[PDB]
Symmetry: C2
Subunit: 314 residues, 2 copies
């Protein structure tokens, strides 16, 4: 019947959901309703908008679309139509760790969407970003905040048996202090790599010695060879008996039914367009770790986009 | 669990599906595979691409995404991985009426997507198109081709009982000749309206007399008042006893489970951004027809995005 054609129409207009979600975030609808403490009429909503004079017909149509997306609700209460929050809209309310406002605003920004229009030129023998265009660190600082919190709470035993840990690329050290606070017996050292402000083997040849090296979202930015060199340096830095490397990064499984499978594939494409990196399958991680001369590995799933790869070098 | 958060991530990256579909169309993947007559290996596919030197890793990742979208297929045949067409991909193969290549290329064009980024400024008291940017008529000529074909085949009886018909805005008359050919006893007259190349009542005051007036995708571009004036002129043009108006246009029902509900809502938003028109609910059509002094109406669903409103003026 129409189901296959509708599948195509829904793919064609998929950008509408992204850009109506952006509008809902730019209008701060979720927080207006949340701060009000109860559902709101259209005119009540319209008065609190950071805009000035408001087209209420157009707001009504935006609200209708958002209700159909099941992000907001519409109810007849006392013969008046009132707008509320659907459960998913909780991730649009500010003031808690899982708030997604920053991610939405960064990803749906027009300039950061622009490379995706150049996906084709990206298949013909330069990053799509340059062809497209010639801060949001909170979206990353927050992301690294949810990852660390998951590590401590969901699979804390990966930090068992060690007394020292080096976090490569942790910058100021915000991330690794979750470890330092949950495990005060672990001496945590942050280590940023020396890099040119204008290869991998020399950039990594003086990693501080520690029982374990942690690399959160590092290796997805490097090709297989440079990753092998990185892993070899890390192997040099850890003790023979109980030393290990902790990689945090996506494990791609297109056969998975996990709710995040789709977005993980999408982020692989985004890495292709913007950085030239990739997200690796379990098999790719296996071959890369074995090719580094490591002895074993173990993947742990956490309630995050990334997974955890424990890699044992000896 | 993660299902609500995944709902949000899938909304955020909804534009990825649109723009990977565009890439698949720009690469002509569906027709390469179709013309080959059987599934193809990555290197076989890569050789036939209108590109020149081809990044095969990047093509592989695009193909992986397209297979996960269930538009293309991947199979191990003779220990070799071969890419084929999933059923929906039939609408990507050229050479038949329901081919959607033109629609995909027009809608996902970057400049025609640009207004959607200005949805917010569109809620503050000018069409988003001007704020965004300061042929595809085949997508319309084809669309009007599928509508006419549906009219004749699915609800042909709407043209029963008449011997004359005027098609307002049919241009050259391609559309109304489906009627003229299926119903040779119906004298069909096309009538384009006089318009300024730089209101509605004078623009419509000399519609040719006929048993019936047909308006395909006209009224969604006019506000309620101008539509009422239009309908009054049309009422003047048709006979008292068996005269009628035939409107073809979306009937919006957000409560519907029809596969096209979502895209119909989206097109209402698109009309808001680009033209300032709207798509009307059944109740809005009812109130507008009754407000025009008409006596009745009847909605017929067809296998098209638009529905059919028979409006009886006497």
């Amino acid at each position: 019947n129409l189901s296959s054609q509708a599948k195509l129409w829904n793919f064609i207009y998929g950008f509408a959901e992204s850009l109506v979600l952006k509008c809902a975030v730019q209008l701060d609808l979720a927080n207006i309703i949340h701060n009000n403490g109860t559902s709101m009429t259209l005119s009540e909503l319209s008065s609190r908008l950071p805009s000035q004079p408001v087209n209420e017909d157009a707001l009504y149509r935006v609200m209708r679309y958002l209700v159909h997306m099941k992000l907001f609700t519409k109810a007849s209460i006392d013969g008046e139509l009132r707008y509320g929050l659907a459960p998913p809209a909780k991730f649009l309310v500010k003031g808690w760790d899982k708030c997604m406002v920053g991610s939405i605003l960064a990803i749906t920004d027009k300039d950061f969407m622009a490379p995706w229009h150049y996906l084709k030129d990206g298949l013909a023998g330069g990053t799509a970003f340059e062809k497209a265009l010639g801060l949001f660190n909170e979206a990353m600082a927050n992301d690294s905040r949810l990852i660390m919190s998951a590590l401590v709470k969901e699979c804390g035993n990966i930090f068992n048996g060690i007394t020292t840990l080096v976090d490569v690329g942790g910058g100021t050290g915000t991330a690794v202090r979750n470890i330092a606070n949950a495990f005060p017996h672990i001496k945590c050292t942050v280590y940023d790599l020396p890099h040119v402000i204008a290869v991998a083997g020399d950039m990594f040849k003086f990693i501080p010695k520690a029982d374990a090296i942690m690399m959160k979202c590092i290796l997805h930015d490097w090709d297989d060879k440079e990753c092998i060199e990185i892993l070899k340096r890390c192997k040099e830095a850890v003790p023979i008996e109980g030393g290990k490397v902790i990689i945090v990064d996506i494990v791609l499984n297109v056969q998975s039914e996990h709710p995040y499978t789709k977005m993980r594939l999408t982020l692989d494409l985004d890495m292709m367009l913007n950085t030239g990196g990739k997200e690796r399958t379990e098999e790719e991680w296996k071959n890369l770790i074995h090719d580094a001369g490591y002895k074993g590995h173990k993947i742990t799933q956490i309630t995050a986009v990334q997974s955890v790869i424990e890699a044992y070098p000896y």
